[PDB]
Write a protein that binds this ligand. Structure first.
Ligand SMILES: Nc1nc2c(ncn2[C@@H]2O[C@H](COP(=O)(O)OP(=O)(O)OP(=O)(O)O)[C@@H](O)[C@H]2O)c(=O)[nH]1
Ligand SMILES: Nc1nc2c(ncn2[C@@H]2O[C@H](COP(=O)(O)OP(=O)(O)O)[C@@H](O)[C@H]2O)c(=O)[nH]1
Ligand SMILES: Nc1nc2c(ncn2[C@@H]2O[C@H](COP(=O)(O)OP(=O)(O)O)[C@@H](O)[C@H]2O)c(=O)[nH]1
Lengths: 433, 428, 373, 80, 49, 428
C-alpha cells in the first residue's frame, strides 16, 4: 500500500543499511530468520510471501566483495533475498572514473533489473531512500549512474538521499575533495532532497552525550538508522499528523538547486542519564537547535534557517509541541530568512522509538529535525577550497583521466559547485525590494 | 577472487619469498605439507588471493620463484614451507648473473625470461579478477636487478591493467655489499620508474637498526630481517583477504597515495614491534601503534622523513578497534607535525581498517608513505654512478655484454629526472 | 578480608535491560560491596548491613538489598567457587504415600540438618509414571507390592540441598529396610516414623546419576508428571501461603504441625517462585484496600513460597479464626492462640496469608493450583 | 645463555626458553636459526586466530530475555 | 492506470474484511474485561467493609 | 508551589548533604532506587520542593554536587542513597583543591564555576516559582570556602530576589583539622556577609558536646556529626513541605530573624535529643522540649548563649501540640530570663508548628537563634588571623595564586566591622 524502496551503495551505505534493517526488524517484530512470531504496518519495508517469509524492499549494491559477504555470512543470512544483494568482483578504489565510466556497466543492468522487479510488486512507491557516501568510488559514481537511470525510468518519483558528508577536519582519504565535487555536480540535477551527515560530528555527539569514548562504526551507523527510522515512520504507523516523503521534499526544498538540509536528533542519552532528566517535549525540541547535536559540523549561527521539519514520535502532546515552537520562534540566537515566517513543519507519530541491544535508551519521546539552512555554504566552501588547492597543479588527475573520463568534467563540476556557492548567497541575503 | 601472483626472483628475493609465504601460511593455516589445519572459518574463504586449490585440500601457492643458478632454488625446496611451492613453478637456469644487470637483462635472462613468462600465463589465467602481480627483487646485485626488471617489463605489457607492487631491496646507505651495485641498481631504477605502478624501497641496513634497537635481538640473522619485510608484505594486502570495516584494495593504497604517476617510490614500515623480552609490558593501543608507526627508526628504509617531506601516507590498521581513535590519532599526527607534510594535497592520509589481528597480537599497522625524502636515496646511488662512469670503471663487462655506453647515460638522466620532481613538490 | 564474590542481575523498573552487577559479602563483619560489569566503576561502597545472612548466598537464589532486588547467576571467582562449589548437592527426597499424615515431622527433620528446600509438590502418581519410577527394581518379584503402595496415596516430592546431600540424606534414611532400621535403632526417619521395608517413610536416589533421572521423572523441565492432587472444587476449601519469610528462616514443617493438630485437612501443596506480575493477580483485591499493598507484594515475591489448600473441619472455629487477625501483634494479645499469634512476627513478615473474604476462596485455590501449574 | 653482566644482559636472560636451546649437534646459533626466530609476535606463536569480526560482534541475534509483562490470569482471560 | 487503481482497491478491501472482524472482537473483549473489573471492584468494596 | 536548589561544595558539605538527602528521602518515603514506597499521601503534596519528578515517577534531587577532586563524588555515589542524584549534576574536576581559598576563588575553582552555573541555571529554570538556594559547605579548608563563596557571589548576582541559605561548618576552638582555618574562614566570611541571607553555623566540638553529654555516645562518627545537621536541615524547611497551622517559610524566617541586613549569623539547634538510657525515662512534652532547646548544651555552635543577649529566636515545632503550651511556655522563657533577651526588640521569638512529625518521632523542634554570642566565634578567628598574619606566615601560596595583602587586610577589617555591631546591639 505505502512502500518505499531502499538502495544502499558502497561499503558505507551497506553497513548503514544493515543497521537500518536490524532496527526495522526490531521495530516490526521481524526476527533474523525471516518469519514473524505471531498489523499490516510491516508492508512499508518488508514484503509478504505465503507461509510468511517477510523479505526486505531494498538492494545493497557494492562493486567489491567482503562487505556484502559480511552480510550473507552474518546473522541476517536467511532474511535477505540472494539476488537482493549485489556483489561485484573488482573494487572501485576511490576513483569517480571507476565509479561512473568504467566499472558501472558490469552491474548497472542487473541493478536496474532488480529495481524493476521490486517496483513491480509495489502498489504505492512513495520513493527511493538512497544511502551512500561522498567518498569511495562505488558510493560516488555508481550512485551517479543510478540517479541518471532512475531519472529516465521513474522521473515522476521521489528520491531522498542520506549522504555521508566528508569530514571537514579529519577525513579518511585525499581524493574525497575530487569525489565530492564530481558526485555533487552529477547528482544535483537528479536529486530531490539530500540530508547530509558528518561522521566526526557524530563522533562529537557520541563522546559528549552517549559517553562512549571508544565508538565504532556500528555505533556510528545505528544513530543514522534511527534518523531514517524517525523519517520513514509516518507512512508505517498512525498518529496525530501524517507526513510523507513527497511532503518532506516539497517542504524542505525552496529552490531546485537548494535541496541540502541538515539532520539532527534528540534524546541522544545513554541509558544511565535518561531517567534523572525530565525529557520533556520542550527540551527535546530545544536540544535540536544547539550547535552540538547537529549531525554536520557546521554552525547554524553562521547562517540562516530556511526550513525545518520536526518529526515527533512517542507519547507526544501536540500542544506542548506548539508551545515549544512558540518559545523557539522568539529568541534571537535563532534567525530565519525574511521570506519564511512559516518555517516549521510538524509530524507526529504514535509509536515510541524502539531500542536494539546496544547504546541508546528506552525513550517514550523523540524528535528528529530536518533543518535546511544556508549555513551549509560554509561547509561547502571548505572542501571547495580543498578542491582549488588540490587542482592547482593536477594532483591525482592521471588515474581519472586515463581510466576514460574526460578532463573537462573537472572544470564543469568546479563551475557547477561555484555556481551553487553563488546561488546560496543571494538566497541568504535579506530582501531590500 | 582478486587473486595476487607473487613473482620472486634472485637468491636474495627467493629467501624473502620463503619467509613471506610463511607469514601467509601462518596468518592462514596452510601447514608445511598443505592440508588446511586452519582453526577459524574466516581464513579458509579468501585463500584464493594468495593460495590456490587442488583435489585433496592441497593449496599450492600461486607463486613464481625464478633464479639464474640452481642454488637458492634448492635451498627453498628444502628448509621452511619448502615442500609447498609447486615443483613446476620453480623455474631455474644453469649459469649465474654475477652481479651484472647486463646478463640479467640481455644475455642470461633472455634465455630464461621467455620460459618464466610461460609459468605466469598458466597461473594468471586461473585467477578470476587477477588483482595484480607483486615482485620481490634486489636492485643491489644481479639476477633480480636485471632479470626482475626484464620480467616486470615484459609482463606489464601482456596485461596492462594490474597494479605491479614491488617490495625491493634498494642498495643500503653506508656499508656496501657489491662494487657493481652502483651501476647495476641504477639501471633498475630507470626501468622501474617507467613500468612499476607503486614500489616500496627496503634497505637491509635499515632493518638491521630496527632489529638491534626496537627488537634488541643480539645476533640478528638475515632471516630475522626477512620476517619484518614479509610482515609489511602481509599488512598491505590484509583487507583484500580478511573481512573488516573500511576495506583497502591495493589499487586504493595507490589511488590515495601516488600524486603524479612517476612519483611512486614509497617507504614501507610495520608497527607493533617491541623487544621479545618487553612485549608482556606493551600497552598495544591505537595511540602507541601510530606512535611507533609514523616515527622514523621504525621505517624499513634509510631516509629520515624529518630531513624531507611527505606527499601522501597510508595506514592499514588491522585489528578490531574504535575508528574514532584511528581518525583522531591520524589527525593529531597531521596537525601537530605540519611542516613534515606538503600542503598542495590536503587530507594526506588513508585510514584503512581490517578485522583480523596478525596471529598472536591484538592491533597492527603497515606504514606506506611517498616521503619526498626518497630523493636522498636515489641521490647516493646517482652520486655513485657519476663517481664511476666518469672514470670508466668496471664498465667493460656491461659494454662487452651488449649494453651501450650511451644506454648508461640515459639511466643517469632518467634517474636525475626523478631525483628532481620529488624535490619541486618536495619544498613548495 | 575474606570476601565472597557473586554475579547478579537486577531488573530496573525503568529501561528494561537486566542491570548486571557484582555482589560482595563479607562474613567477618556483615558488609556489602557491589561492582559494575558494564562500566568498571563502584556501586554501594563497603557498608555494614544487618539483614543479609550467609544462607541467602546461593546460586539462583533471590536476594533483596536496598530495594534493588538481585538474582544470582554465577559463582564469582574460583575461590568462593571452591568454598561454596562442590559443597552444594541437589537431591530428590520423596515422602511415601504413607506418613503423609505426619508430613510436618519429616519436613521438620529435613529442616534440622540445614537441608535447604527448593521445590515441593504433592502429587498422586499416574499409572504410566509408576513404571518409569520403578526402574531401580525392574523385573523382580516386588513390582506388585511397590506399585500397590506407590500408586495408592498422594506422594510429596522434594528438592533438597546441602553438602554431599546424597549421603547425608541416606544417613537420614538409615537402612533401606524399615524393619532393619527398627532392629538397629540408629535414630533414622524409618526408626521413628516407618512401618516396613516396602512402605517405610522415604527412599529415592542412591547417587547423582540416579538423582538426574529421578529429577527428570518427578520435576520435568517443561512440565508434565504431577496431576496436581488438589480437588479444587471441594466447597469448604481455603488457600493459604506459608510466606517467603517463614520459608527462609524455615518453619514449613512446624506450620504443618500446627495446622494438622487442629483437624484441618491439608489437600494440596506446591512451591512456586513468585514473579511481580503474578503476585499482582493473587493480591489483586488488595490495592486501594490496604494502604501498604506494596510491602505485601514485595514480601510475596521476595523469595520462594509454598501455596497450600486446607479443607475446613473442626466446627465453630473456621480457618479465619485459626489464623486470627492480620497483624501478629494484634493476635498476640487479642485471641492469643492463633498460628499468626505465635508462629511469626512483625506485620510485613507474617506467617500465612488467608483468603480474607469467603467467596474469594476457590479463586486463590485455582490460582496456585490450576491457573499456574 | 648470557652468563655475564656485559651488554644485553636482560634479553640474554630472557628468550632462552625460545632462543637458547638447539640440541647438541645442531651447530652454533646462526647455522640453525638462519630462518629467524619467534619475534615480532609477542610470546604466543600457537595462539588461535581471532574470528570475532565487527559485524558478528555487533549484530548478534537479539532477544527480549525480560520478565513478561503479562499476568497469567489475564492470559487465560484474553485467550478464552 | 486502470489496473493501478484496481490493485490497491483490491488490497484495501481485502485487509478491510479481516480488520473488521478482529476490531469488533477486540471491542467486545474490552467490554468483557471491564465487566470483570466491575466484579472485582464490588469485591474490593466488600473486603474494605 | 515552591522549590529550593541544593548545592554541596567541598568534601564536608558533600557528606553533610548526602546524609541530608538520606534523611529527607526517609521522611518523604523515597527508596534508593527512585520509586516510592510510603505510608501517607500527605508526603507527596510538596515533593516538588527538593525532588524533581522524572519518567516513571522516579524522583531525583534538585541538588548540584561540586568539588575540585573526584574522590568525594564516588564516595557519595557509592553511598546507600547514592544513585538518586542526577549524574550530569556531578560536576567534578581533575585537579587539586589544595585547601586554599586562592585556589578555590581565582584558579581551577573559578575555572569550574562557569560549568557548574550551567546546571545551577538549568535547575533554576526547570521550576515554576523558585524561592531559595541552600549550600552545604565548610569554611575551614578550600573548595567549600573559595568555590562556595564564589558560588554565593555569582548566584546572588544572577538571582537577586531569592533567599540564600548556607549551612556552614566553622572551625572549633579545641582542635584544627588543618593549619589554615583562619586564612580560609576570614576570606569566607568577608564574602558571606554582603551576600547570603541565612548563614547557619555548625561546629564540630558542639557536635561532640551533644553526642557525648546529651546523646551519651562514646565513639561518634561523621555519620553522627552530619546526621544532627541533617535533622536540623530537614526541620528548618518543614512548614513549607508539610501542612499545619502557623506556617513559616524561609523568607518569613529571614524577615523575623534579621533586624539589620548584615546581622544574619545564626546558631541552629535540634532538641528531641534523648540518649538510649534516658529514652524510656523521658517525659516528652512541649514543656520539656522548650527547656531542652533553651538549655545551652544542645546549641550546635561552640558559643555560650549566656554570654550575650538573644536578638531574635525562632522555633519550628513539629507534631500535634497545643498553642497554649507553645505560646505560654515560650512566654515564660522570655519572662524567666529577660536580661538574656534584648529590650529594643520586644516579643522577639517566632513560632511555627507543623502537624507532621519526623518519622518514628512525635514532637520535634528546630531552634534558630540570632544572638550576640556569634561574636566569640568571630573574634576568635580574628585574633587567630592577627597572630598568623603579623608574621606573614602561610601566605606565599595566596600571593602566588593572586591574592593581595590589601584584600587580606580588607577581609580582617570587615570581620572587625561585624564584630562592632554585635557588641553595639548587645550593649544598646
Ligand atoms: N556508518 C558508516 N560509515 C562508513 C562506513 N564505511 C565507510 N564509511 C564512510 O564512508 C567513507 C568511505 O567509504 P565508502 O565510500 O563506502 O568507500 P567505498 O565506496 O567502499 O570505496 P572503496 O574504498 O574503494 O572500497 C569513509 O570516509 C567513512 O566516513 C561504515 O561502515 N559505516
Ligand atoms: N631482507 C633480505 N635481504 C636479503 C636476503 N638475501 C639477500 N639480501 C640482500 O640482497 C643483496 C644481494 O643479493 P643478490 O646478490 O642480488 O642476490 P641475487 O638476486 O640472487 O643475485 C644483499 O645486499 C642483501 O642485503 C634476505 O634473505 N632477506
Ligand atoms: N559535619 C561533618 N563535618 C565534616 C565531615 N567531614 C569533614 N568535616 C569537617 O570539614 C572540615 C574540613 O573540610 P574541607 O577540608 O574544607 O573539605 P573540602 O572543602 O573538600 O576541602 C574538617 O575540619 C571537618 O571537621 C562530615 O562528614 N560531617
Amino acid at each position: 500500500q505505502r512502500e518505499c524502496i531502499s538502495v544502499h551503495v558502497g561499503q558505507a551505505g551497506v553497513q548503514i543499511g544493515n543497521a537500518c534493517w536490524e532496527l526495522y526488524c526490531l521495530e516490526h517484530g521481524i526476527q533474523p530468520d525471516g518469519q514473524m512470531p505471531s498489523d499490516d504496518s510491516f508492508n512499508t519495508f518488508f514484503s509478504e510471501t505465503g507461509a510468511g517469509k517477510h523479505v526486505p524492499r531494498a538492494v545493497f549494491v557494492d562493486l567489491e566483495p567482503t562487505v556484502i559477504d559480511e552480510v550473507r555470512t552474518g546473522t541476517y543470512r536467511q532474511l535477505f533475498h540472494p539476488e537482493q544483494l549485489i556483489t561485484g568482483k573488482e573494487d572501485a578504489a576511490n576513483n569517480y572514473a571507476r565509479g561512473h565510466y568504467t566499472i558501472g556497466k558490469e552491474l548497472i543492468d542487473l541493478v536496474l533489473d532488480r529495481i524493476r522487479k521490486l517496483a513491480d510488486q509495489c502498489t504505492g512507491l512513495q520513493g527511493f531512500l538512497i544511502f551512500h557516501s561522498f567518498g569511495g568510488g562505488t558510493g560516488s559514481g555508481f550512485t551517479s549512474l543510478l540517479m541518471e537511470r532512475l531519472s529516465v525510468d521513474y522521473g515522476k518519483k521521489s528520491k531522498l538521499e542520506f549522504s555521508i558528508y566528508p569530514a571537514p577536519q579529519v577525513s579518511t582519504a585525499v581524493v574525497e575533495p575530487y569525489n565530492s565535487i564530481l558526485t555533487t555536480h552529477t547528482t544535483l540535477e537528479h536529486s530531490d532532497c539530500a540530508f547530509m551527515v558528518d561522521n566526526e560530528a557524530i563522533y562529537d555527539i557520541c563522546r559528549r552525550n552517549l559517553d562512549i569514548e571508544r565508538p565504532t562504526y556500528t555505533n556510528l551507523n545505528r544513530l543514522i538508522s534511527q534518523i531514517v527510522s524517525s523519517i520513514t515512520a509516518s507512512l508505517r504507523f498512525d498518529g496525530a499528523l501524517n507526513v510523507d516523503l513527497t511532503e518532506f521534499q516539497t517542504n524542505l526544498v525552496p529552490y531546485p538547486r537548494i535541496h541540502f538540509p541538515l539532520a539532527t536528533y534528540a534524546p541522544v542519552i545513554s541509558a544511565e542519564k535518561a531517567y534523572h532528566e525530565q525529557l520533556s517535549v520542550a527540551e527535546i525540541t530545544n536540544a535540536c537547535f544547539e550547535p552540538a547535536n547537529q549531525m554536520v559540523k557546521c554552525d547554524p549561527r553562521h547562517g540562516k534557517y530556511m526550513a525545518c521539519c520536526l518529526l515527533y514520535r512517542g507519547d507526544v502532546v501536540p500542544k506542548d509541541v506548539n508551545a515549544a515552537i512558540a518559545a523557539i520562534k522568539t529568541k534571537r540566537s535563532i534567525q530565519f530568512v525574511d521570506w519564511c515566517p512559516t518555517g516549521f513543519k510538524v509530524g507526529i507519530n504514535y509509536q515510541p522509538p524502539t531500542v536494539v541491544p546496544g547504546d541508546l535508551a528506552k525513550v517514550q519521546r523523540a524528535v528528529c529535525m530536518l533543518s535546511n539552512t544556508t549555513a551549509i555554504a560554509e561547509a561547502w566552501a571548505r572542501l571547495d577550497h580543498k578542491f582549488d588547492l588540490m587542482y592547482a597543479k593536477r594532483a591525482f588527475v592521471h588515474w581519472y583521466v586515463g581510466e576514460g573520463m574526460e578532463e573537462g568534467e573537472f572544470s564543469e563540476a568546479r563551475e557547477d559547485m561555484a555556481a551553487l556557492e553563488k546561488d546560496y548567497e543571494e538566497v541568504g541575503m535579506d530582501s531590500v525590494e | 577472487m582478486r587473486e595476487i601472483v607473487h613473482l620472486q626472483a634472485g637468491q636474495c628475493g627467493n629467501q624473502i619469498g620463503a619467509k613471506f609465504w610463511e607469514v601467509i601460511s601462518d596468518e592462514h593455516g596452510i601447514d608445511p605439507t598443505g592440508t588446511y589445519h586452519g582453526d577459524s572459518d574466516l581464513q579458509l574463504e579468501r585463500i584464493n588471493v594468495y593460495y590456490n586449490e587442488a583435489t585433496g585440500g592441497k593449496y599450492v601457492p600461486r607463486a613464481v620463484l625464478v633464479d639464474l643458478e640452481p642454488g637458492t632454488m634448492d635451498s627453498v625446496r628444502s628448509g621452511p614451507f619448502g615442500q609447498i611451492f609447486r615443483p613446476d613453478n620453480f623455474v631455474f637456469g644453469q649459469s649465474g648473473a654475477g652481479n651484472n644487470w647486463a646478463k640479467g637483462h640481455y644475455t642470461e635472462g633472455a634465455e630464461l625470461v621467455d620460459s618464466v613468462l610461460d609459468v605466469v600465463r598458466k597461473e594468471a589465467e586461473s585467477c578470476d579478477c587477477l588483482q595484480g602481480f607483486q615482485l620481490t627483487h634486489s636492485l643491489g646485485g644481479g639476477t633480480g636487478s636485471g632479470m626482475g626488471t626484464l620480467l616486470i617489463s615484459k609482463i606489464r605489457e601482456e596485461y596492462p591493467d594490474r597494479i605491479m607492487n614491488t617490495f625491493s631491496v634498494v642498495p643500503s646507505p653506508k656499508v656496501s655489499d657489491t662494487v657493481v651495485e652502483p651501476y647495476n641498481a641504477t639501471l633498475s631504477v630507470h626501468q622501474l620508474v617507467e613500468n612499476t605502478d607503486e614500489t616500496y624501497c627496503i634497505d637491509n641496513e635499515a632493518l638491521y637498526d630496527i632489529c638491534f634497537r626496537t627488537l634488541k635481538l643480539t645476533t640478528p640473522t638475515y632471516g630475522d630481517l626477512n620476517h619484518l619485510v614479509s610482515a609489511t608484505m602481509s599488512g598491505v594486502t590484509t583487507c583484500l583477504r580478511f573481512p573488516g570495516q573500511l576495506n583497502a584494495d591495493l589499487r586504493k593504497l595507490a589511488v590515495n597515495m601516488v600524486p603524479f604517476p612517476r612519483l611512486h617510490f614509497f617507504m614501507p614500515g610495520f608497527a607493533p614491534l617491541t623487544s621479545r623480552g618487553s612485549q608482556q609490558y606493551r600497552a598495544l593501543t591505537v595511540p602507541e601503534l601510530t606512535q611507533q608507526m609514523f616515527d622514523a627508526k621504525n621505517m624499513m628504509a634509510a631516509c629520515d622523513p624529518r630531513h624531507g617531506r611527505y606527499l601522501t601516507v597510508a595506514a592499514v590498521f588491522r585489528g578490531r578497534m574504535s575508528m574514532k581513535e584511528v581518525d583522531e590519532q591520524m589527525l593529531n599526527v597531521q596537525n601537530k607535525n605540519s611542516s613534515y607534510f606538503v600542503e598542495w594535497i590536503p587530507n594526506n592520509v588513508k585510514t584503512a581498517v581490517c578485522d583480523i589481528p596478525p596471529r598472536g597480537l591484538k592491533m597492527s599497522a603497515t606504514f606506506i608513505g611517498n616521503s619526498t625524502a626518497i630523493q636522498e636515496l636515489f641521490k647516493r646511488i646517482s652520486e655513485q654512478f657519476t663517481a664511476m662512469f666518469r672514470r670508466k670503471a668496471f664498465l667493460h663487462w656491461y659494454t662487452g655484454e651488449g649494453m651501450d655506453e650511451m644506454e648508461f647515460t640515459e639511466a643517469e638522466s632518467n634517474m636525475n629526472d626523478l631525483g628532481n620532481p620529488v624535490v619541486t613538490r618536495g619544498a613548495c | 578480608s575474606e570476601r565472597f564474590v557473586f554475579i547478579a542481575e537486577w531488573y530496573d523498573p525503568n529501561a528494561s535491560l537486566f542491570r548486571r552487577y557484582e555482589l560482595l559479602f563479607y562474613p567477618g563483619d556483615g558488609s556489602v560491596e557491589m561492582h559494575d560489569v558494564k562500566n568498571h566503576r563502584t556501586f554501594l561502597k563497603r557498608t555494614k548491613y544487618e539483614d543479609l545472612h550467609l544462607e541467602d548466598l546461593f546460586i539462583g537464589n533471590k536476594v533483596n538489598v536496598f530495594s534493588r532486588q538481585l538474582v544470582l547467576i554465577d559463582y564469582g571467582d574460583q575461590y568462593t567457587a571452591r568454598q561454596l562449589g562442590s559443597k552444594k548437592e541437589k537431591t530428590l527426597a520423596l515422602i511415601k504415600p504413607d506418613a503423609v499424615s505426619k508430613a510436618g515431622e519429616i519436613i521438620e527433620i529435613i529442616n534440622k540438618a540445614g537441608f535447604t528446600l527448593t521445590k515441593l509438590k504433592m502429587m498422586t502418581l499416574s499409572r504410566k509414571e509408576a513404571t518409569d519410577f520403578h526402574i531401580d527394581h525392574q523385573s523382580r518379584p516386588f513390582l506388585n507390592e511397590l506399585i500397590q503402595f506407590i500408586t495408592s496415596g498422594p506422594i510429596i516430592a522434594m528438592e533438597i540441598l546441602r553438602d554431599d546431600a546424597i549421603c547425608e540424606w541416606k544417613k537420614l534414611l538409615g537402612p533401606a529396610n524399615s524393619g532393619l532400621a527398627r532392629t538397629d535403632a540408629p535414630g533414622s526417619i524409618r526408626a521413628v516414623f516407618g512401618t516396613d521395608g516396602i512402605r517405610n517413610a522415604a527412599h529415592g536416589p542412591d547417587s547423582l546419576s540416579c538423582a538426574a533421572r529421578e529429577m527428570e521423572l518427578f520435576f520435568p523441565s517443561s512440565g508434565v508428571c504431577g496431576p496436581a492432587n488438589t480437588a479444587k472444587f471441594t466447597n469448604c476449601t481455603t488457600c493459604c501461603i506459608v510466606k517467603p519469610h517463614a520459608i527462609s528462616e524455615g518453619l514449613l514443617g512446624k506450620i504443618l504441625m500446627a495446622i494438622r493438630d487442629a483437624g484441618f485437612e491439608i489437600s494440596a501443596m506446591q512451591m512456586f517462585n513468585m514473579d511481580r506480575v503474578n503476585v499482582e493477580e493473587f493480591y489483586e483485591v488488595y490495592k486501594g484496600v490496604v494502604s501498604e499493598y506494596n510491602e505485601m507484594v514485595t514480601e510475596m515475591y521476595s523469595g520462594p513460597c509454598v501455596a497450600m489448600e486446607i479443607q475446613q473441619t473442626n466446627p465453630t472455629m473456621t480457618f479465619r479464626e485459626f489464623c486470627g487477625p492480620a497483624d501478629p501483634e494484634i493476635a498476640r494479645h487479642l485471641r492469643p492462640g492463633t498460628l499468626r499469634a505465635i508462629f511469626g512476627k512483625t506485620k510485613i513478615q507474617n506467617a500465612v496469608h488467608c483468603t480474607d473474604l469467603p467467596e474469594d476462596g476457590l479463586l486463590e485455590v485455582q490460582y496456585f493450583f490450576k491457573i499456574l501449574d | 645463555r648470557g652468563q655475564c653482566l656485559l651488554y644485553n644482559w636482560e634479553e640474554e636472560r630472557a628468550t632462552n626458553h625460545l632462543d637458547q636451546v638447539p640440541s647438541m649437534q645442531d651447530g652454533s646459533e646462526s647455522f640453525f636459526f638462519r630462518h629467524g626466530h619467534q619475534g615480532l609476535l609477542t610470546l604466543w606463536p600457537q595462539s588461535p586466530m581471532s574470528s570475532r569480526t565487527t559485524q558478528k560482534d555487533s549484530y548478534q541475534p537479539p532477544g527480549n530475555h525480560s520478565q513478561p509483562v503479562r499476568g497469567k490470569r489475564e492470559a487465560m482471560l484474553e485467550m478464552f | 492506470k486502470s489496473n493501478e487503481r484496481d490493485r490497491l482497491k483490491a488490497e484495501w478491501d481485502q485487509h478491510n474484511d479481516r480488520k473488521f472482524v478482529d476490531s469488533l472482537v477486540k471491542a467486545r473483549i474490552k467490554d468483557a474485561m471491564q465487566g470483570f473489573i466491575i466484579n472485582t471492584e464490588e469485591r474490593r468494596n466488600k473486603l474494605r467493609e
